[PDB]
Amino acid sequence: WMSFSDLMSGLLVIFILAAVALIIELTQKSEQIDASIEELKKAEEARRNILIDIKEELAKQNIHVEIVENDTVLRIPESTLSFESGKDTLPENTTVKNEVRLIGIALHKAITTNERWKYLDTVFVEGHTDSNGIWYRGKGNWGLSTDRAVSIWKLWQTEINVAPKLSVLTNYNGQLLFSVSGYADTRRVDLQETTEEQRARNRRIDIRFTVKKPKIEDYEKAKNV
Amino acid sequence: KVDEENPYWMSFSDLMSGLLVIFILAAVALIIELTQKSEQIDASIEELKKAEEARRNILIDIKEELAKQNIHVEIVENDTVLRIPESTLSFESGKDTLPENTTVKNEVRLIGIALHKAITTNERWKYLDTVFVEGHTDSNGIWYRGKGNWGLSTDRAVSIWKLWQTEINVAPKLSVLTNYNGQLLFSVSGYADTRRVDLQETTEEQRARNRRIDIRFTVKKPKIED
Amino acid sequence: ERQIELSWLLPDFSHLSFHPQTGTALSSLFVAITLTVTLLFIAYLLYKSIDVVLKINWLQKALEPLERKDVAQKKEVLYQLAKSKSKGKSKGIGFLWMEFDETLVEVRKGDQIEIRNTLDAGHFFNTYTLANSVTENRLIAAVPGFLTALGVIGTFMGLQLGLADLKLGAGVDVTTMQDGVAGVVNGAKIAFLTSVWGVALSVFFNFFEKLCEQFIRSKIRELEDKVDFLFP
Amino acid sequence: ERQIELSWLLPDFSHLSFHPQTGTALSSLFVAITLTVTLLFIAYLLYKSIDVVLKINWLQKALEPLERKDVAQKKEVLYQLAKSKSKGKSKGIGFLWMEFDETLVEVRKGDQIEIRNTLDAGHFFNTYTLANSVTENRLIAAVPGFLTALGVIGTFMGLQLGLADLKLGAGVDVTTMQDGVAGVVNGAKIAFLTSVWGVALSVFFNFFEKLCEQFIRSKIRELEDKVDFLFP
Amino acid sequence: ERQIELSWLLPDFSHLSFHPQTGTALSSLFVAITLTVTLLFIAYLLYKSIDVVLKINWLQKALEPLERKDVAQKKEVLYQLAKSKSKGKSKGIGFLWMEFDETLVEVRKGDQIEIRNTLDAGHFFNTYTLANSVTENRLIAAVPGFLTALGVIGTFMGLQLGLADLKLGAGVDVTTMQDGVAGVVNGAKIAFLTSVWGVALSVFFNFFEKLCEQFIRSKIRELEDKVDFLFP
Amino acid sequence: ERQIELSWLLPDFSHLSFHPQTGTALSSLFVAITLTVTLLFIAYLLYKSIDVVLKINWLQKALEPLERKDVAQKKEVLYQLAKSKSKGKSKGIGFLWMEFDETLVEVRKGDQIEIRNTLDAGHFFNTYTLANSVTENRLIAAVPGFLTALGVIGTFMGLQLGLADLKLGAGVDVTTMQDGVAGVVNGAKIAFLTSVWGVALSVFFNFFEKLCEQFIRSKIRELEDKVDFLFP
Amino acid sequence: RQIELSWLLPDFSHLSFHPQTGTALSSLFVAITLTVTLLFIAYLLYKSIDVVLKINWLQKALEPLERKDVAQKKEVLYQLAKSKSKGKSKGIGFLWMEFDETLVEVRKGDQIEIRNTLDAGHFFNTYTLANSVTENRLIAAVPGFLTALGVIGTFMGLQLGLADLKLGAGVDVTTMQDGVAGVVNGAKIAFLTSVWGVALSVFFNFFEKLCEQFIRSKIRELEDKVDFLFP
Ligand code: NA
Ligand code: NA
């Protein structure tokens, strides 16, 4: 038994080496899988980094925008960007025109930084109005909110000198990135909407960012086999 | 007789066997960690596979419900997009209004009724992230009071959206429907000619393939964090 | 608490062969060999143990209905009972009474017949004479070592079968490493199944062998007590 | 850093059963068997050891009033006193005094009766004639090995049972793997707990047995020197 | 149930040399050495036990055709033919008869002229005088320890040389050390093969030499049967 | 070539107690017991060896100046010296020397006076009479087994206590399971330390006891070398 | 994987009693194990040459002997038995003294050939020639000690290997890889100490029993000489 116990001790050492070597490989395979799980959340990470980039970059220029709706929408309040009442054109006060160029430049720089458009599906320029019914050539607030989003999107095309144009940027799938939306007063942020300071919170331009979603193969590859 | 055999040497082989099993559990514990990671990913694949089957069942029943009513719609983009061609839903040239023959607008109603019924059947909006009502035009540059195809394509999607808001009576309106979260299910937007299905633009029917209404369905993210 | 099943300790003897292809076939082969070795050596130990016991037991029946007063005329009545059973047998129980009789001396009282000895009965009835075949049997004393080392061979073979199943090195998938660990578990089950039977059978024989020794010694002292009581 | 309680080593004997179904039930039964084996062998040891001590104690009790010059006036009464307890007793202490008596040769030291022995008293009062049942008892000397091997049997039994429920292989889920680990730990609990008691009871009997022999040999030497003192 | 492979139990002995370059070659050499040592000691034990058996058989064939009474005429005619073989030996079976044939005394019971021994023949014909170099030979008793130890040396040498190949450290590349550990585990199975063979041959020799001993004493006692039945 | 820390092998005895609350304290207590048991048996062995040597050297010093022609006229001085060292005791070497004298008888060689002996110096100066509990002590010979047992009990207790309260099973999270399993593996070196000390002290004591036996026996032979030289 | 058996030989140059490395510790064990073997080989040889010297004298002092010297050597052997045994009442002479003093004087014919009454076998055999090497409890324990020394090296090697092995949560690969190196370092101690501990145990055990059979070879050769010389 003296030699048997010595022999069994030798077996224990060999199995200890195998167990720790097995654990070393299994451990590394875990961070491989863990890293792959973090890669599946990178599109939402890229979206959040775009919005923080726009807000921070414009904040250094005294331009207030808001990140809203679960860090998905860049809200441009009427205090920042105000259209003429009942009109889709910004006023000729030679400042809002300057004001809106810097938002387009900020929007461009945040999307093209780190090529985060590879995680974007569509960016929507959304026009929103208050409940005040107007006529507006018969189109109502539905045509007003749509025309304001087109008005903003046209200015971001022909009055900012960004080398990769906003109208040229593609998305994760290779199609063009931007879309234009109008929702009239059907997506109001303020429901009571009594005072003029509450109606004004509904008159806004919303930049909605939609990201690409992982496919089946993205999850199958994350198993790291 | 003085010297007895030392009987406790055998206990060390006993000890070594037990120590062997302890180190087996050290490696087995990692096996379970890796196995749990694989089941967590497998849970997301099956959850996403269920959401994608809910997507295509929505599209098959919209097409089949509309097919019985002589309304032809297309399922394109790998069981993801409901395409309403110009042969089905034709807008007046350069305008977002629809013809006043009382028959075209009835089809638009029936598409919305079929669309609502497929989403609300079997609670399938719980698998959806967003349903996109998509306005698309051809590459022909137009004025449209200075808005161009961006104004026209968005207006056409809105006019369909407004028709579904007032002229169909579904108990939860399409504009009230929510996704797997509490967020609104539907998005309405125009794309001008930026996302054409036909690129060479040569003939009229090739250009006519671009003037369309797309209804794009996106499914929920399976939330790998289990 | 979880339930356990002790039938996992039982080998499967239905498919025994000397060409095992699975771990359970190999462990049941080792247990069968160890059991067969155990059974054969128990039979051999019992064959020579019962020989001694029956050899002693005949005297006990021959001395049962004897008292202090009747030994005078039982000297030769017991002589033919010993003679009939001592046909050619050299140094068994029959010849020991033949050797014992000549060493009996009569007491000088003259009247009444009383019998004594010129030497103690230890020199006539002891382990060296009645059971020297089992007490010093060195093959018997080595049997627990045989069974122990048979289990040790099964232990080493099983564990190094588990060593062979291990799939190590860089670039090995989890399923393959999982299968290697299952092979290690499979080999360890062979090792522990053969060990538990090897040790248990070794202890059983070791205790049974030394129990037989004490039982025979208890029977020899019974002769020593009874013979010397009747023959001071 | 982790706190330990030594009471965790005591098994629960409240639910002892000869068909254990859980790990603790089997480990408790296994320790109960090991305790029972230890207690039975201590009873076997003490049964024979006390038999030796009483034989020595009485003859010591029959010699302390005796001094060198009072041996002659007390030599014969001891022979009758030895007959007093020796009804039979073929190899008892009373009989051991018998054979010693006839070997005490008589010499005349001028005018006072003095008794000498031609041999040494150790030839009649030693372990062979007083404690042959405990000193060279191979069964008793093997008890520490039995108890240690019991604990070893519990290890291979416990480890085999734990590993038998550890199911690996493709398709086995986390719940099944997680339950397999619990069974393996339960098997390891059986293994180490039975080794704790197997070895502790072994070394306890090991020490207790050889403490009894040293105590008995001390009294045998106290017997040899006193008899040598009285009978030069 | 996993399949197992056992063909690796048999080493390849074709490329045997005393300068092994690999662990497989080193394992094969030690198994061959242990086999050769086992065969050398089996032949030594087997040849030198047949020598003992032949001496016993020679005299048995000289006493087989003798009844109880035809011993007076054979008392001396057997003596002359003993000398024809006894010449040259030191303490052979011939001289062993010489020292015993002379010490028979001739008893005269009138017309009952017979032959009788004066003491027990246990120190004249026994395992000491015939089996002087097998039963008490402690070199032969040490062979199974040698065989196990050579297997142990071969295994630890195989394990040690497997480890010395390892370029290892915390600063060494992980993939390098995964391959190094894999080679160590693979070589450990081959290294432990010598211990399996060493223990197996140790058990086989242990069993064999105690079997020959029990066979030798079977005839020595069988020889004493003829001596105590024809030479009272 | 990485560094090893042997100081970790020596546990801290600053807070020893008989109620260990951690595995480290349990390990330290068992190492302390194994060391304490080792020292007590070494101290007893040294004490019972020094006294033999010291009391042998008293007779060596007395016998050192003697010569063959000196013994005749010097005998009575030693008996006076023996009675100066022995005041009436029946145990010391002085009592052994005086009991030796009666065995010395006087021979006649021409006209000179030269004394002989009837018995041998080994009858009065041997291990039994001089170093009784130093040589044939089974308890001392079992101490290496005790040390081995005590060390491995500490390891089994450490391992069992590390597993005793582990919450495992399908209702337990994987992270909790890995913490419990890792704690057991990380604590193995703590429990194993007592086995290292138990084996090391077992081997040291076994070697130490057998050296003292040879040293005492060498002094016995030297004592009876000079006694037989001066008293043939 | 190519092996070299020279890797089994340790480096004894920088030996010390405070080993800082696994190689130094294993070298120390092999040095102690080798040292124990050499002293016990000398202790075995020293107590074996004395047995041979006793036997040698009866062979190297009886060279002028022939068959025709049955009696006139008997007396002259007596004072040469006392020549070395200058007052010793023991030793090889004491065996001769009892054998010489128990020889009956026989009378056959004119010549005076002497005959024995008992064989010299029981007087000049093992239990009194070589009792210091055949029943020596220390020598018998040497192979077990040598093997047990290797087992100590194994246990210390295993314990040193576990000393730096850390597993579980919060342990990265580099720390675990350092644990592999420590286990390997301890394993090299364990395996090397067992190689030498058991090999020297074998060498001593076989050497010890080669000396014994050589002792019987001289005892028998002495006995065979006496048998025909002294019937
Ligand atoms: Na156990
Ligand atoms: Na070692």
Numbering used by the authors:
A (entry chain B): 19 to 243
B (entry chain A): 11 to 236
C (entry chain G), D (entry chain F), E (entry chain E), F (entry chain C): 4 to 235
G (entry chain D): 5 to 235
From the paper:
Using cryo-EM structural analyses, we show that the Zorya type I and II core components, ZorA and ZorB, assemble in a 5:2 complex that is similar to inner-membrane ion-driven, rotary motors that power flagellar rotation, type 9 secretion, gliding and the Ton nutrient uptake systems. The ZorAB complex has an elongated cytoplasmic tail assembled by bundling the C-termini of the five ZorA subunits. Mutagenesis demonstrates that peptidoglycan binding by the periplasmic domains of ZorB, the structured cytoplasmic tail of ZorA, and ion flow through the motor is important for function in both type I and II systems. We conclude that Zorya systems, on their own, mediate protection by recruiting nuclease complexes that can damage host DNA in vivo, leading to population-wide immunity.
ZorA I-ZorB I from Shewanella sp. ANA-3 and ZorA II-ZorB II from Sulfuricurvum kujiense DSM 16994 yielded protein samples that allowed structure determination by cryoEM at global resolutions of 2.2 and 2.8 Å, respectively. The structures reveal that both complexes consist of five copies of ZorA packed around two copies of the ZorB N-terminal helices, as seen in other 5:2 ion-driven motor complexes. The type I and II complexes largely differ in the degree of elaboration of ZorA and the length of the ZorB N-terminal helix, with the type I complex substantially larger than the type II. Unexpectedly, the C-terminal, presumed peptidoglycan-binding domains of the ZorB components, are ordered at the top of the N-terminal helices with the domains dimerized. Similar domains are present at the C-terminus of MotB, but structures of the MotAB complex have not resolved these domains, and they are considered to be mobile with respect to the intramembrane complex in the inactive motor state. Although the arrangement of the ZorB peptidoglycan (PG) binding domain dimer with respect to the rest of the complex differs between the two Zorya systems (Fig. 1h(iii)) by a ~35° rotation, the dimer structure is well conserved (Fig. 1h(iii)). As for all other such complex structures solved to date, both complexes are presumed to be in an inactive state since they show no open path for ion flow from the periplasmic to the cytoplasmic face. By comparison, the Zorya complexes are blocked via a collar formed from periplasmic extensions of ZorA TM helices 2 and 3 and elaborate ZorA periplasmic loops that pack against the ZorB subunit (as also seen in type 9 and Ton systems). In ZorB I, mutation of conserved residues proximal to the putative PG-binding site (H186, L199, R203, R254, and R259) causes loss of anti-phage activity.
